[PDB]
Structure formats: structure tokens, C-alpha cells
């Protein structure tokens, strides 16, 4: 079953982080050309998201995921829902979003006290914490990479992301689990290393997006093994 993904950039490229989980599966992307991942224009955003969902339906997608965490959480639960309802009505397909994916992953692992490890700015981390509070999770703290530009993003490796999660956890030792939400960075290998070092499960947002969209498409394909408890499943 073909999985459709709506993405932030104009070019319409399948996200790199998570694709490794499903090497045999067909993924098609359609680019919003947003200029932001946290845009102004409540109606305009819904409108472009609808337009792009319809483009994906015409290309044979069996489901559509809005594959951007920030865009789906920055205006809280009411907006994540509005996005989902608008896509499904315009397409007749089951639709979902990366923020729903994250919720779904955290629930599957039993997490309700969640430490945040992100690459976002303060205001954005605050909106994330607010979204998760609305969904009956307790955000217990946050540590962020605090980097910008391709150069610095390029310089991130697995170790950087593992250390990030350990930091976030040390700071919030009461946490049930960790949400790694590091848009644009490669996180898969970090997941089971963090779970080993800490004994607490990790959800990574982009990989959760792939997993959740693959679940929704209901084909039964399993993620490649070795990428943490959620995906070992």
C-alpha cells in the first residue's frame, strides 16, 4: 500500500529519518513549500495541506500523513485534529500527522511522564510541552541541541543525540520515557543506545511518523529490527 506524506519543503522529498525502517515500502511525498513549519495563517495552512493531500490521493496514496511534528503541534490539539479531519474529508483516505504518531508511540510504550530532547527553539519547545499536557502526558523537562544552519546540523552524529537524551533524563529523573524530536536529524541508531544506557523507552518523532503511517495503512509490514522497543514491537 502506498503511503502519502505531506512535507514542509517545496520540493516534496520523503523525510530521511525513519525511511530506513521500511526499505521495501512505497512512499510518495508532496511539498507544501511553507517557508515555515510553524506558519501564520490558520486557514491558508489547512487549505494547502488539503490541496497537497488531494495531490497525494491522485497519485495512489492509501493513506496520508502530514509529516511534520511542529506544524501539527504548534497550535495545540484542536489544530492537529482540524488538520486530520480536513485531510480525511478532502481525500476519503485515513489521514494522520506526525504529532498523532508521537502520541501513539508514547501510549504504546506506556509513557506518561515524558522528558523532551529536541532541536527546537524555546517557544516551540513550549508549544510541544503544551500539546503533550493537553493529551494527558506530563512533560517533565526539556534539553535542546541549540544549533542552526546546515553546517551544524551536518555535524550532529549519533553520540550527540545519545548525550542529549541522557542529559534530558538526568535533569528529569522521574520520567517514564523520552521524546526525541530532532527535526531533520538522523536518530534511529540513537534510540536503542539510549534505551540501553537508561532503561527507559524512547520515541523519535520522524521515525514514529513512518511507523504510524505504516500502521494506519494496515498492510502488516514490520519495521526492521534493532531500533528500539517501539519498533521491535
From Swiss-Prot:
Statement: the UniProt record of this protein carries the keyword Ribosomal protein: no
InterPro entries in the cross-refs: Iso_Racemase_Enz_sf (IPR053714), MaiA/AMDase (IPR026286), RibuloseP-bd_barrel (IPR011060)
EC number from the UniProt entry: 4.1.1.76
Ribosomal protein recorded as keyword: no
Keywords (A to Z) from UniProt: Decarboxylase, Lyase
Domain of life: Bacteria
GO molecular function, one term: arylmalonate decarboxylase activity
Substrates-to-products reaction catalysed: 2-aryl-2-methylmalonate + H(+) = 2-arylpropionate + CO2
Protein name: Arylmalonate decarboxylase
Species for this entry: Bordetella bronchiseptica
Amino acid at each position: 500500500p502506498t503511503i502519502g506524506m505531506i512535507v514542509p519543503p517545496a520540493a516534496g522529498l520523503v523525510p530521511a529519518d525513519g525511511a530506513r525502517l521500511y526499505p521495501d515500502l512505497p512512499f510518495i511525498a508532496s511539498g507544501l513549500g511553507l517557508g515555515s513549519v510553524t506558519p501564520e495563517g490558520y486557514d491558508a495552512v489547512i487549505e494547502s495541506v488539503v490541496d497537497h493531500a488531494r495531490r497525494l490521493q491522485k497519485q495512489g496514496a492509501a493513506v496520508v500523513s502530514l509529516m511534520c511534528t511542529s506544524l501539527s503541534f504548534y497550535r495545540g490539539a484542536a489544530f492537529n485534529a482540524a488538520l486530520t479531519v480536513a485531510m480525511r474529508e478532502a481525500t476519503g483516505l485515513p489521514c494522520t500527522t506526525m504529532s498523532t504518531a508521537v502520541l501513539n508511540g508514547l501510549r504504546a510504550l506506556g509513557v506518561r511522564r515524558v522528558a523532551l530532547a529536541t532541536a527546537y527553539i524555546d517557544d516551540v519547545n513550549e508549544r510541544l510541552a503544551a500539546f503533550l499536557a493537553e493529551e494527558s502526558l506530563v512533560p517533565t523537562g526539556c534539553r535542546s541541541l541549540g544549533i542552526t544552519g546546515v553546517e551544524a546540523m551536518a555535524r550532529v552524529d549519533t553520540a550527540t543525540l545519545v548525550d542529549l537524551c541522557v542529559r534530558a533524563f538526568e535533569a528529569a529523573p522521574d520520567s517514564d520515557g523520552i521524546l526525541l524530536s530532532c527535526g531533520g536529524l538522523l536518530t534511529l541508531d540513537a534510540i536503542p543506545e539510549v534505551e540501553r544506557r537508561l532503561g527507559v523507552p524512547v520515541v523519535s518523532s520522524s521515525p514514529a511518523g513512518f511507523w504510524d503511517a505504516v500502521r494506519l495503512a494496515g498492510g502488516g509490514a514490520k519495521a526492521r529490527p534493532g531500533y528500539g522497543r517501539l519498533f521491535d514491537e
